[PDB]
Design a protein around this motif. Structure first.
Motif, PDB file in Angstrom:
ATOM      1  N   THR A  14      -7.217  63.356 145.019  1.00 50.91           N
ATOM      2  CA  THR A  14      -7.094  61.966 144.547  1.00 50.91           C
ATOM      3  C   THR A  14      -5.960  61.109 145.185  1.00 50.91           C
ATOM      4  N   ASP A  30      -4.351  57.129 145.393  1.00 50.75           N
ATOM      5  CA  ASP A  30      -4.276  55.795 144.745  1.00 50.75           C
ATOM      6  C   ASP A  30      -3.354  54.913 145.555  1.00 50.75           C
ATOM      7  N   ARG A  58      -0.045  55.429 145.839  1.00 50.71           N
ATOM      8  CA  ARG A  58       1.216  55.413 145.123  1.00 50.71           C
ATOM      9  C   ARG A  58       1.633  56.825 145.187  1.00 50.71           C
ATOM     10  N   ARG A  97       0.904  57.707 148.660  1.00 51.79           N
ATOM     11  CA  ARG A  97      -0.327  58.521 148.578  1.00 51.79           C
ATOM     12  C   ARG A  97      -0.679  58.854 147.135  1.00 51.79           C
TER      13      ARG A  97
END
Ligand SMILES: N#Cc1c[nH]c2nc(N)[nH]c(=O)c12
Ligand SMILES: N#Cc1c[nH]c2nc(N)[nH]c(=O)c12
Ligand SMILES: N#Cc1c[nH]c2nc(N)[nH]c(=O)c12
Ligand SMILES: N#Cc1c[nH]c2nc(N)[nH]c(=O)c12
Ligand SMILES: N#Cc1c[nH]c2nc(N)[nH]c(=O)c12
Ligand SMILES: N#Cc1c[nH]c2nc(N)[nH]c(=O)c12
Ligand SMILES: N#Cc1c[nH]c2nc(N)[nH]c(=O)c12
Ligand SMILES: N#Cc1c[nH]c2nc(N)[nH]c(=O)c12
Ligand SMILES: [Ca+2]
Ligand SMILES: [Ca+2]
Ligand SMILES: [Ca+2]
Ligand SMILES: [Ca+2]
Ligand SMILES: [Ca+2]
Ligand SMILES: [Ca+2]
Ligand SMILES: [Ca+2]
Ligand SMILES: [Ca+2]
Ligand SMILES: [Ca+2]
Ligand SMILES: [Ca+2]
Ligand SMILES: [Ca+2]
Ligand SMILES: [Ca+2]
Ligand SMILES: [Ca+2]
Ligand SMILES: [Ca+2]
Ligand SMILES: [Ca+2]
Ligand SMILES: [Ca+2]
Lengths: 145, 145, 145, 145, 145, 139, 145, 145, 145, 139
Positions: B141, B143, B145, E145
């Motif tokens: 996963t 995102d 961030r 990330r």
């Protein structure tokens, strides 16, 4: 008073009370440290040792004493894991054994050697090829912190 | 000192003291960085290099020295990751090797090139095929961030 | 293009459209990098810059352009973090600002310099004192992985 | 070659180029190791040092060598931390400095010694008293895993 | 059919059934997107809106419609959070309200604006100064990330 | 080996070589177990011990044995924590000490006992009053 | 047979065995569901409940039963959480109690209403006010997955 | 200024400098957003694209602009993924390529459409069949938080 | 009154209500403790237990009681885990069962012995063999804290 | 509005515009709840639905309503999953489908029902045999 000079003879074993069965036994060793060969500069690692025993089982105090015998020994990381495995193989004559070392980085790079073994010609040799070929199919996230 | 443009000549190696068994040696390289060919803008990644050695093993410090050589060099991430493997392959002549880079996003998009190799015609070639076919079956996963 | 040696002249700003209330604006800068003054070797960090604006606000792209200017520049981490704040302070004249950098370790040691500032003689100076006195009361766990 | 005998004299410093403001500088030290004074057993800890510099600043490499000097040096953990703080106070004459050791367990019991210091009679003496009264109000969950 | 042109008038409220009590109510809005002012380039953010109500409470469907009205609107991130707060203040006349936005990075940097408010002259104004001065005392780890 | 009977006489101290300053020393003890006040059923906790020494300091192993001796001992909770705190006071006579035990919830009930002590007539006694006040706003 | 019309008459109480002390008793309902009063559409949440009793305690089985009596009740989330706290307040006359609810999103927005109470005039009242003032300083990351 | 209307023609490619070996290249795309064909409601997802290149390679910026073109374009999510894979197949003529969308929930239900393709009759067609038979054997926990 | 001498005669069984199916029933004992047979010194662990019944199920209260009967029993960890599996095997005649134990460290080394069984000849036997072969591929990070 | 009576007639499909290839489509459904087989007490699960379409595809909202209709309905577990799987088969007549429900453990018992279907006479029927075989080696 402990020897910090490589000493395989400190290792001990005890009989297996459940031979007629295959089980795993893992040793988490987050306190491993040794020296670099050229510089004498200390290195650090967490080591995971998982193995399936036959007749002989490694007694953890001796494991501790054997791991302490590397404090003044100056060897490379890959060698180190492999030597740790050979002496354990000779000690126990196990069905399967794996050694996974995770060192702290030097110059922004960390080395994680992984080595295993299966009693030759058996299905554990097959498992060893299996765990090897499926080894670290998803390396863990590292950022040096 | 430190060269900052491609310099694969700085890579060195040492004899494999455990040639008679297969084992992975992984390099977590989270401090890697280089430039984008046209713009000149910089990029960053974490690179995981796992390999099963034959007779030669890359020397850590030299690997570091080799990855610094990409600091002032413009290339794409995919190219970059293949270039790295080539000049490890040519240096060590490994049984198996793979390079997985994970780059920080541009325009909201991250590029994770993965490439691998096994000696032509040996069982390591089947491995390279296996690990590639079963590669990143469950992507992680992101995102940003 | 991209200059890679200290160049605080590239920093720009824009009027604060909400001057009449205090609010934090934080910049997560995890792609920062520079050199070590004597060796020339490179270093990396993640820098968090939180600030309460007055009338001027740093323009994002220019901030990026400013942090790239440290790529080929030799400095210490502590110096580096203070230098950053100075040339934001001088650019924006903020009510409050702080710079917390978290560097990747060398010789097994990471350096996290933290520095802050509030306009001389205003309540932001009390804040700077508060946030500094109560700073990093519970340090975060580092294992270098 | 190094030596691993207590050596406070190896510590170095450099002038603080930013004397006119208060800021913190923390060193995360996860590789600390020393000996138990009696048994001679190695021990390990993660040491966090945070200090506010006056005119001098400890040079991280010197600190590295300094911290390694405890490798073959026996002592209880609470002394150990005090010793490290004293040696830094003499070296640097800081405005403030605190040291927090986190040792791995012995007998399923771990000792986390926290020490600090303010420049006598200055307002840092009061900060030290504040960070000590408020030290560890909400301690972290520890299970020894 | 929704307007993607800034439209504050879409907001609605409903009466508070528990006025005589102070409670928090948070809105997690991970689907916020708007455009940059100069380029029209899309931006993305997760927004957390927490507030203590008085008489009027924001109905979430309208919040959703109001958040959708930014899709074609080109404004800066800091402005955006602040405009979002003003219109909510005018809508509800709340005791306390905070807006915390977390944007995805552009050019390797991500902007997280945090803004709040307390009904002037009351204890919520005090809380707002409190949450502000104690804001992000420990910024979260980010690596893009 | 080992005594599993309450055995405060096993505690041992060593002198503090740094008495000019106030410093904390915490002992994380996640293997504490004893017998409950009624049933006779075991209970378990992680015991967090923090203290500012004065002139005496507790030796870790001695402490380890001391805590084991509670294994086959029966007494209520609050008692159990103070027993510990008090023996530690009588052993070291420190400036400040606090003992917090976190038992594995038996009902839906935590039961996390928190006690502390400041040396009477001192600022530590105000600190004890202070921490105790802050402890409960969040355990 | 069960009751799925709002039924607080279901709640049972018992003795606090620890009347001298202040211990939090926590309940955690991971699958609560009611109805939207606007349309008849179902909603879902996890309910966190913590309280310090006085004389009384709620027998947890009647709490689960009480929570299931919302299955067919129309109400907003804010309202809903506050109602549960009231009914628990009336049943137990707790020293302190708080209810934190976490709803699943609708229209890409999730609502977490947090509410608490401390006996009026007591320190519990003040304990509750400190908690509203420091409630959820760092909101957890939500991405709707 | 951009446009957010379906625009497959904006995609570009560059020659694959490493044709003589098989390797994967993945794009993590967390900012994808488009519309529901009826309602006109925006929707969001994280899209992972992984492909094995033959002679062409998609240029990430072109892909960026391409993925943005869906911003004001309506369509169901399963089509959406197919459309993206087709457009890339025509652009690149890959050996292999797969696309996995992960959409945020609507009505508490999220749709994760997975598509893939092998160059017809080649061994990649069999890989596609392998990764499809073995696709998502152990699905991730999703609660919509 | 309780039994703290090894007592398997304590275990009770009951009906499996789901004899047609294969569902894992999991038990999780976070506070198990026995004794070292070598010295008399206590040891501590978390015990994970999963099994697919046939006709019988172990009534969980007698399992807790059974686990407490180890408080004063001398045995190694490997032995210990295997004994618990045997006693459960004899009580239930499960289709499949596994016991994974996690001990706290001693001498800075923690032992996790993992053991399982599947009815001989059945697929359960084969199910157990696949599990030993793929057991704990990625060992969790341990740092003794 | 809403039906809380089992209502399979609410399901709705749309045509698949891509029938030359096999592709999966998964529906994560973490808000499923119904009434248990005996007590009448509610139970809850996250239902994971994956399927390779053929010519027809299920419309999400229709599916959302369909699942709600189980709210005030009483039937055992395994039944409950197959009910769903089957209605989905009759609705789409896909190549492959699998429904896995993860109920919040009521005893120490998971009860996670896993069913699947492959279109008879095809390779999908072997895939169903294959996944079902791999499912249980690890749920
Ligand atoms: N010590 C040491 C080492 C120095 N260079 C190294 N390079 C590699 N690959 N491995 C090592 O263990 C070391
Ligand atoms: N710089 C740069 C790039 C611009 N487009 C790109 N596309 C790909 N696939 N890779 C890259 O490294 C770049
Ligand atoms: N490069 C370098 C450094 C070497 N010693 C250092 N010591 C400190 N405190 N900071 C630094 O950045 C460095
Ligand atoms: N090493 C060692 C020790 C043995 N007992 C100890 N007791 C204390 N308080 N501290 C220590 O460091 C040690
Ligand atoms: N959009 C946009 C922006 C472009 N530069 C910016 N700089 C800052 N500080 N903030 C912003 O929101 C933007
Ligand atoms: N159900 C429902 C709701 C619809 N709009 C809402 N707005 C708020 N603030 N709360 C709610 O519970 C709802
Ligand atoms: N947008 C939208 C949709 C509405 N119903 C849907 N059903 C499916 N299977 N997919 C979709 O993308 C949508
Ligand atoms: N207790 C104890 C032990 C002491 N040495 C041991 N070695 C092993 N492998 N296992 C054990 O349980 C012990
Ligand atoms: Ca070594
Ligand atoms: Ca890390
Ligand atoms: Ca590049
Ligand atoms: Ca992330
Ligand atoms: Ca520098
Ligand atoms: Ca770490
Ligand atoms: Ca020591
Ligand atoms: Ca832990
Ligand atoms: Ca904007
Ligand atoms: Ca991240
Ligand atoms: Ca409701
Ligand atoms: Ca999430
Ligand atoms: Ca769409
Ligand atoms: Ca989730
Ligand atoms: Ca034992
Ligand atoms: Ca740990």
């Amino acid at each position: 008073n402990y020897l910090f000079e490589y000493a395989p003879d400190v290792l001990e074993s005890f009989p297996n009370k459940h031979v007629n069965r295959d089980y795993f036994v893992k040793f988490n060793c987050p306190e491993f440290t040794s020296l670099a060969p050229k510089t004498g500069q200390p290195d650090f690692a967490t080591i995971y040792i998982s193995y399936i025993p036959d007749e002989k089982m490694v007694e953890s105090k001796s494991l501790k004493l054997y791991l302490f015998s590397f404090r003044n020994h100056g060897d490379f990381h890959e060698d180190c894991m492999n030597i740790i495995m050979n002496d354990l193989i000779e000690l126990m004559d196990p069905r399967y054994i794996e050694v996974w070392g995770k060192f702290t980085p030097r110059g922004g790079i960390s080395i994680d050697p992984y080595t295993n073994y299966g009693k030759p010609g058996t299905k554990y040799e097959k498992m060893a090829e299996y765990r090897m070929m499926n080894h670290d199919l998803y390396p863990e996230t590292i950022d040096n912190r």
